[PDB]
Amino acid sequence: MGHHHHHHLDSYAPRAEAEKTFSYPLDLLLKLHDERVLVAFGQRDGIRVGHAVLAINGMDVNGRYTADGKEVLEYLGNPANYPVSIRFGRPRLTSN
C-alpha cells in the first residue's frame, strides 16, 4: 500500500571526482549509453560501473564527443592518444 517515494532535485547528482591519469591496455572499459560515455567495467567491487566521463585533457566532453568533436571512444581508442587525463563522476551532474 502507498508505495511512496521522494528524491532530491532531478537536475542534480553528487560532485565530480578529481582529474586522474589513464592509459591502455588497462583493467578499465568504457561504453556509450544515453549520449554519455560510462564505465562498463573496472570496478574493485561495484562503485565504478555507471560513472560517466565529464572531461578529457581539460576538454569538457559534449556528452560522447570531445570539445573538438572526436567521438570519445575512438579518441581514447586511438593509441597515439592512449596516455590521457580524465575527469569523471556521477551522471546528471547537471542537466546540461
Side-chain angles (χ1 to χ4, degrees):
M1 66 179 181
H3 305 278
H4 307 121
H5 186 250
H6 179 66
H7 56 80
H8 190 260
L9 175 62
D10 164 64
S11 321
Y12 228 76
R15 56 155 289 169
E17 300 189 3
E19 189 176 277
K20 181 189 164 293
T21 37
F22 288 87
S23 298
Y24 307 100
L26 180 60
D27 182 41
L28 182 280
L29 182 64
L30 304 180
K31 57 80 175 286
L32 170 62
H33 268 19
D34 188 44
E35 298 298 324
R36 296 296 180 276
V37 174
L38 267 62
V39 179
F41 198 85
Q43 73 302 327
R44 176 57 186 84
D45 177 76
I47 63 171
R48 214 90 304 228
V49 287
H51 287 72
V53 180
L54 296 171
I56 302 169
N57 68 63
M59 292 189 180
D60 173 88
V61 298
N62 175 32
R64 54 133 155 182
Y65 301 90
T66 57
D68 181 76
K70 305 293 179 180
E71 187 169 57
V72 163
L73 293 177
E74 297 192 288
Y75 187 68
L76 291 172
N78 176 7
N81 186 54
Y82 265 4
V84 292
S85 303
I86 307 186
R87 306 182 190 172
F88 69 125
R90 278 47 65 179
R92 197 72 184 288
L93 179 60
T94 308
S95 310
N96 173 253

